[PDB]
What we know:
Layout: H1 7-31, E1 34-35, E2 45-46, H2 57-77, H3 86-90, H4 121-145, E3 148-149, E4 159-160, H5 171-190, E5 219-220, E6 231-237, E7 245-249, E8 265-269, E9 274-276, E10 280-282, E11 292-298, E12 303-308, E13 311-312, E14 333-336
Parallel strand pairs: 1-2, 3-4
Antiparallel strand pairs: 5-14, 6-11, 7-8, 7-14, 8-9, 9-10, 11-12, 12-13
Helix pairs in contact: 1-2, 2-4, 4-5
The structure holds adenosine-5'-triphosphate.
Family: Belongs to the ryanodine receptor (TC 1.A.3.1) family. RYR2 subfamily.
Protein name: Ryanodine receptor 2
Subcellular location: Sarcoplasmic reticulum membrane
Amino acid sequence: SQIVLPPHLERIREKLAENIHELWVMNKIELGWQYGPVRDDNKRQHPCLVEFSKLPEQERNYNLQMSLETLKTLLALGCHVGISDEHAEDKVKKMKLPKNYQLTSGYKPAPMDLSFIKLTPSQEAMVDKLAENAHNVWARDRIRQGWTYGIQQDVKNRRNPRLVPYTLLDDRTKKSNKDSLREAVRTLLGYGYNLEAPDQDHAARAEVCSGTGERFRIFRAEKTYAVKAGRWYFEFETVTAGDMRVGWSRPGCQPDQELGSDERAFAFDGFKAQRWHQGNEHYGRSWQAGDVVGCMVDMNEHTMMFTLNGEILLDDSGSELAFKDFDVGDGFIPVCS
Ligand SMILES: Nc1ncnc2c1ncn2[C@@H]1O[C@H](COP(=O)(O)OP(=O)(O)OP(=O)(O)O)[C@@H](O)[C@H]1O
């Protein structure tokens, strides 16, 4: 609402709403809706099939406002307007209509040959976000009327199943509102205004919206299973690649501390390929989904090793050992974060 429409944009706003009226005339007279004063689309009735006024001029100015808040959505997302010159405004290669795709009267739609005008993939992304915003506006307006989500439609209970996030919206309404807004962007382009696309801003939510304040879940064996001598082996299977660690920990590891951040554990972080004991150092490769890590500890000579899908992981140098100088302490138990 605080966004003010530039004069550049508003002096062609009128032609934009005119051509959206022209979109009803073309689309309805082509797909079969003939002229009808009431919106009885069931029996192919079209009230929008005539010049601005005879279809309610309040609806024509509603199209004016559709252009207004559409370009305001462009500025709110950050889509800029690009004008070269009023000669580019006058540039029209008058696109021709048969009577089937043309309205009965002389309010003839003919901007230009929109076929060759193309969209950047980023531009299509912003157009899809425009459709997103329009769908949210519609759904919230329905909420203002007092509607709600459902699986079957009941106007008595005001339960529309279509009230869902746009990602889960049904593809039929989805393609209709998409291609409609795509054509609206085509209209804006054919009236000279091209958009100098805003930079595709890069971001990431870090996938950290877990249960309350938890960030990891440490799984260890019982403290009475600690091994102080011999050679031992266990496998860790990676179902989903991500922030996971595996290794051997002392029988004093704190459940709320990240594995390897202290002296109480010896872990392998294959997400970013480090080795964790009081700090991180580059080690080994990075796993994928279904990868199996094999942890091997030999307390006789105090060494540790890791294997990804059979092959031994090595350090930055050619050393096979992952941890080679540590005391026996109270033993070690398998652990994974
Ligand atoms: N007379 C009109 N002709 C075309 N679009 C209109 C008209 N009045 C309002 N609109 C806008 O265009 C949309 C067209 O939606 P549509 O034709 O599918 O019907 P609806 O009233 O939204 O509901 P339904 O999906 O149940 O038919 C409306 O939701 C509204 O935003």
